[PDB]
């Protein structure tokens, strides 16, 4: 909830804490690499919530066998593909990683036909997380 | 250490991860959210040696030469050590203390993906700059990297 206490850490403590977090997430299987943690988390969220299988390194195959792209973005004050997939799922997080929006974008949409999946993703992800905690 | 991280949920871990990076960006230590170990290396070498960071080359040094800056943190998984005038290569241990820091002229890279092992480190055109980083850094920075 609160992060002003970060002001009291030195840069080396922040950096060591940062890596321990990524070690913790990797050990839980939430992120598969240290390179893009927000993207890896979205992929873990969407795959578990919607019954998709992740691909190592399309990002996933869904429950009907379609090829899916998963991209994520976090809202703050601060600032082609030539590969085939059937649709993109785009997740937008707030500062504390609550889902602001989630979009299903068929590949055909380039540069309307895209629909929100926000409610379905939140519901099935909340069931997923609470179930796993058991 | 930070064993209390085990008591957080994944949403809290990621929120903290992003707030840490925002804190570092606000201090000018990290410049982008993508390469924090590399951005820290650049902050370290630039402040120690009086370089200006660029948004091809990563920095201009105090004599106007173009510098590439690369960093690596050695972890339990592996300890492998793998237009610009020279490259500066920093190697951190797990807790971000500097194991080694090398100055590698572009000419040396041509003659040799570069492996900081064996003959490249004994090439007279290559120098360690760890000692220079320690001397020339401020006592505030130096107290972190002892």
Author numbering:
A (entry chain B): 7 to 63, 68 to 89, 100 to 131, 155 to 177
B (entry chain A): 8 to 62, 67 to 93, 104 to 133, 144 to 177
From the paper:
The BisI family of restriction endonucleases is unique in requiring multiple methylated or hydroxymethylated cytosine residues within a short recognition sequence (GCNGC), and in cleaving directly within this sequence, rather than at a distance. We present the crystal structures of NhoI and Eco15I_Ntd (N-terminal catalytic domain of Eco15I) in the absence of DNA and in specific complexes with fully methylated GCNGC containing dsDNA. Both proteins are homodimeric, with each domain involved in target sequence recognition and catalysis.
NhoI is a typical BisI family member, Eco15I contains an additional domain at the C-terminus of the protein. We truncated the enzyme to the shortest active form of the catalytic domain (containing 173 amino acids) to increase the quality of crystals and refer to this truncated form as Eco15I_Ntd. Crystals grown in the absence of DNA contained either an NhoI dimer, or two Eco15I_Ntd dimers in the asymmetric unit. However, the hairpin of β-stands β7 and β8 is much better ordered, likely because of crystal contacts to adjacent molecules.
